[PDB]
Ligand SMILES: CC(C)c1cc(C(=O)N2CC[C@H](NC(=O)C3CC3)C2)n[nH]1
């Protein structure tokens with residue numbers, strides 16, 4: 550049958566008073582959000598940070614992703630990597646989506662891309678290939694947020710965003726222990742996806758979509774982490790079942806309905822431009838991009 554969308558994860562629209570400190574706000578919403586694994590945070594309408602990346606010199610080499618690579622298990626010269634700019638990648642991304650759905654990219658419903666994505670993942674008749682830039686360090690290209698540094702120029706109206714606590718460059722990243730950490734950038738297109746994973750050291754993670762088409766998320770609360778791992782190991786290929794989790798997490802693709810049928814609670818959301826997504830400790834999550842977009846993420850500690 551067709552894909553059944555999971556229930557929506559919590560969406561918070563804090564006022565200017567509640568939006569003062571991120572760590573205190575996440576701590577207040579924890580009793581609900583930790584029961585869903587992921588949550589979406591919409592900043593106030595007037596909170597609009599400018600895009601501070603060097604678009605003129607942004608040249609990256611995206612990865613190549615075959616959607617049905619695991620289903621094909623039942624030659625490593627499929628496609629080279631190539632190099633794009635932010636504009637040339639966007640032209641390729643919009644052309645791919647408009648030609649695939651035979652309609653303008655802004656007219657494709659999010660539910661349709663969602664149902665088609667999971668059909669292509671398990672399809673052996675069609676081989677769809679997409680590209681995406683991932684784990685791009687914001688120290689080589691600059692962060693999407695304004696940052697006080699000698700390289701970039703900060704307008705007076707942009708200094709508040711360079712000093713804001715919701716600026717991902719200002720999140721605490723040093724974990725406490727007895728006796729370098731920079732946000733990463735993500736340039737996506739239609740069907741470009743990330744498989745089920747948790748963060749290193751079970752850390753928190755916060756994600757911001759600077760611009761572009763939405764990013765679809767799926768989340769599992771931490772109390773069902775061991776249940777997801779049991780379902781994953783029972784249905785993964787025998788060659789990948791005994792692999793360590795940090796290696797298995799590279800190919801942990803699974804339809805959310807399969808997890809839901811085994812009793813694993815799964816929540817979804819469409820992260821739109823200007824919205825935050827927070828994943829809680831040991832909350833497995835996965836998803837895909839609806840189209841050409843630009844995201845930034847960092848793991849933080851409380
Ligand atoms: C900070 C870093 C270690 C990180 C990123 C994520 C993550 O979960 N995401 C999901 C959305 C974005 N990845 C994509 O958009 C790829 C192209 C499909 C980053 N977790 N830790």
Ligand SMILES: [Mn+2]
Pocket residue numbers: 746747748754828834
């Ligand atoms: Mn993550």
